[PDB]
Design a binder for this molecule. Sequence first.
Ligand code: CLA
Ligand code: CLA
Ligand SMILES: CC(/C=C/C=C(C)/C=C/[C@@]12O[C@]1(C)C[C@@H](O)CC2(C)C)=C\C=C\C=C(C)\C=C\C=C(C)\C=C\[C@@]12O[C@]1(C)C[C@@H](O)CC2(C)C
Lengths: 209, 209, 230, 205, 83
Amino acid sequence: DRPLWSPGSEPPAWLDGSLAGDYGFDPLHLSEEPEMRKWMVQAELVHARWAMLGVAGILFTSIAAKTGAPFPDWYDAGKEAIKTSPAPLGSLIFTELLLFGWVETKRLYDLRNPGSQGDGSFLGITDGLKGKENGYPGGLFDPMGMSKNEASYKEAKVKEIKNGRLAMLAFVGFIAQHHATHKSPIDNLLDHVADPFHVTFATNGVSIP
Amino acid sequence: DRPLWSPGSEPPAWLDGSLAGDYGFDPLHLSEEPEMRKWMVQAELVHARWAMLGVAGILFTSIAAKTGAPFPDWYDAGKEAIKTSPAPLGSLIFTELLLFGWVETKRLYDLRNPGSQGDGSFLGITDGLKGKENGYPGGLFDPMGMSKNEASYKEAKVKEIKNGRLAMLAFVGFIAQHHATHKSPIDNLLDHVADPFHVTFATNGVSIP
Amino acid sequence: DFLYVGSDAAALKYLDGTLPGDYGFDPLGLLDPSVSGGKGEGGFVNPRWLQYSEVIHARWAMLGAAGCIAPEILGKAGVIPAETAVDWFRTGVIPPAGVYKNFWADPFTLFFIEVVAIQFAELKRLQDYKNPGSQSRQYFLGLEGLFKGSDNPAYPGGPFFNFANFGKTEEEMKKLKLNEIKNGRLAMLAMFGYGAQAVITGDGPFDNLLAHLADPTGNNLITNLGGKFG
Amino acid sequence: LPGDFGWDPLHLADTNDQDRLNNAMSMEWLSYAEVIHGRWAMLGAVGALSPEILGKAGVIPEETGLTWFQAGGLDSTSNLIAVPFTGPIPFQYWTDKYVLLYTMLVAMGFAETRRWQEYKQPGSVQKQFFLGLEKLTPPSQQPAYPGGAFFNFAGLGTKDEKKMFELKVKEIRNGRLAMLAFLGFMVQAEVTHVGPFQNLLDHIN
Amino acid sequence: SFIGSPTNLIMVSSIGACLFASRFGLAPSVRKVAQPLKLSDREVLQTTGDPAGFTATDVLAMGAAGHAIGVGIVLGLKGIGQL
Ligand code: CLA
Ligand code: CLA
Ligand SMILES: CC(/C=C/C=C(C)/C=C/[C@@]12O[C@]1(C)C[C@@H](O)CC2(C)C)=C\C=C\C=C(C)\C=C\C=C(C)\C=C\[C@@]12O[C@]1(C)C[C@@H](O)CC2(C)C
């Protein structure tokens, strides 16, 4: 009744198609327990969102570098950023660690007990900072969005998870062909468009001995 | 009840003799599906018409070259034309690509739904650019033809498809004895009529080990 | 007529005019229904998978035996240019033997294209072998109607796999089955030959045919085993 | 049938099914193929022995009369195979070397398609159009023995039954003798490169 | 193994002697199981043509034994300086 990851395959019993992007691909039987199922859903959502954010930032920086603006490569960007950054190394990572620890244990204890942070303990807000779904919060994180409508929310969930998986593939592609070519992903794309019949993953010397 | 491609053979059930030149020649049983039959008959009609136009142009150029008018061989004629033509390569092929792609899609969407272009969406004309039959349009393509009479239309359909198949045979023969003799087809005809018992496809060297 | 040279007894007792082959040549014995008895998919030694792999090996051998010898006589003639007309093991399949430099892409690029396309093809084939007709239910570019298959996963048929769709009668279908399996068993030995001839002479198989034709005693097994490169 | 000596040592005719079309091994198909193979064998024997006698006797002008293989172009030492129309023929015909093959292919293809379509569906191949050639070959229940206005135009067998079968037996036995004779000519032309009447004269002398 | 060599003659005579030995009793073939004096004349599979029990494995083993005996005879005669 659903398009699976392989046509004619047997979908898992714990994957009933009620999740976003539920293509029934799970050969290692992970997320079988419902608590770990929720934990895997949360982990996939946050890894997906960070993959899309990092891929978008990498693409924007590489496009700006290709257009002539002074921008670093997606690799060693922070290495040449810190020497001009007023914030030194050490303090920056620790500040982001403290702040992200605050946000992430807040959302962690929201995951453990849904609606636990909607009691007004954090600056007296009740409707906000309360989880609407498994890996989907509400209140502050939906300023104008159409999550009120159920069908549009489901379509946006499917779009978000598919874009997330595409961004994971994009990030592994980024690191792989950066180690292959030592060039920007936009430079690799322009090389592929310029000479598709010869420039590829096979004629780079490395990865094809 | 009809002359077949082989006397005594069994004609196909889908070839009932209601088509132009329906000799029941179908060993691979193509055009069995009605939509596939429509696409087969349209492709055969257009290939026949273009083969007839090509053989007419080749014969005219070869006859003019024999009689004394300056005309190159039917092979590499575009090579000898592109050095003197004002239109350079690239622009000419893409211009004819655009125009005949236009006509290709117009007749394709007339084939899929008949009369879909007779709604006046193109220059506000109704009776023109409308297909009276499957592979046979109507309106401005028949200024003074006798297709209004149905007997003359059927006779002209049979004549057109037979001349088209003869043009297919003429074109494959043209390329075959051009590769065999490296000469014009009119020169080949003159050589065959000069010494019929000797000058033929046996003594050309190539194609006979 | 029937049976063959090997033709072990207690092997013709489970095959008699049923499979498209069934010439009685099972000296070792691998189509016994007692082999791989029980439940589940199990193993590869079973009559269904053996017939499946035999016809797949057969058709692949037909395609290979056509493609190995096809450029050669046409290169002897004026059909294809002799620059492209090279021996089948010198096209890039064995780079120690030789590669064709004048290709539109790198041989590994063509290898990746082949890997993607035939991985799609063979994985759909395997998934339809596990679940018959299951590739006509999942949406695939709007062409699910031609992947319905038949009861035999080896012989799917349909609007595309049999687009000529002749052999509707059982007798003509059985004759076509026997013809396919016999020409495939010929192509078996054709590939076995072609490989052995390539390793014993270093030249192409039609050149070996010309050598046997011009001098049968001077160019045969005994002289070529004692010659250079083998 | 038209012949039964009880000599089937390899048992190649046992196929446990009888059908008019396909399988290439029914008794009727085998008899038809053997009869026409034999008829081609006596035409081959007479065409490969006739220029030999009339060449040395001077009845026919002598150009490769003693060697049918040289007349057809069969040497097996030129480059590849002793396929006819490939060996160097010293005599130039009115049809040089290969359009003769083209005419033979188109004519024999016409006749073979007519024969095959009579074999598949009898009585239907003489209906549509053949420029008036359809009336010469009426249908018959035997594929090897049509008869009629052509073939059996003299009417030497359409008067009884027993003499018809005697002619069948005589024709098939002369045909099998012709097969053995043409295999002999095969062997002599392949292993000696000299015509068979010359070998007859050598083994007489 | 040139046609006319003494080694070729030894090989062909050994092969022919082995086929003669296996044709009419006289050898532990697939038809004849072997006791200390090789009796009891059994039957399995089929001979596929000529009579007795010359199966696909009967001519395969006797050819193997005839070939292997020939290497002993030829190299034995070569070692002592004969043929
Ligand atoms: C484009 C991908 C995408 C999509 C389709 C969604 C969809 C959704 N998210 Mg999500 N989200 C995303 C990315 C995305 N998100 C990212 C990257 C983050 C991290 C910042 C989040 C963080 C997040 C939270 C914290 C919450 C959601 C929620 C929601 C739901 C609200 C519906 C809505 O407003 O539509 C969202 C529509 C869009 C995002 C489309 C806008 C895309 C813009 C136009 C792209 C251009 C901006 C980009 C930076 C420029 C790229 C430049 C590049 C070309 C170089 C819905 C399921 C809420 C929820 O589920 O509540 C029930 C919720 O609480 N998301
Ligand atoms: C047991 C190990 C072994 C192996 C693998 C080889 C292999 C080889 N030796 Mg050696 N040799 C060996 C032991 C071995 N020998 C021993 C013990 C001695 C005794 C001293 C010798 C003495 C010896 C001499 C004196 C010489 C060799 C030579 C050779 C070569 C010729 C092979 C040949 O004649 O077959 C011919 C090839 C075949 C029969 C091919 C096998 C069939 C193929 C694989 C079928 C595959 C086709 C398939 C369907 C399609 C392929 C896939 C495709 C789609 C990509 C070969 C590389 C000769 C040499 O150097 O030549 C290069 C040579 O001069 N050898
Ligand atoms: C691909 C991936 C994970 C893939 C996992 C796979 C296939 C697992 C497969 C299976 O589990 C399934 C499904 C089901 C199981 O039954 C079986 C197996 C087989 C086990 C994660 C990527 C995850 C990728 C992520 C999260 C990427 C994040 C990127 C960020 C944060 C970027 C930050 C930057 O810092 C950089 C790097 C450099 C700077 O220049 C720019 C900035 C922006 C500063």
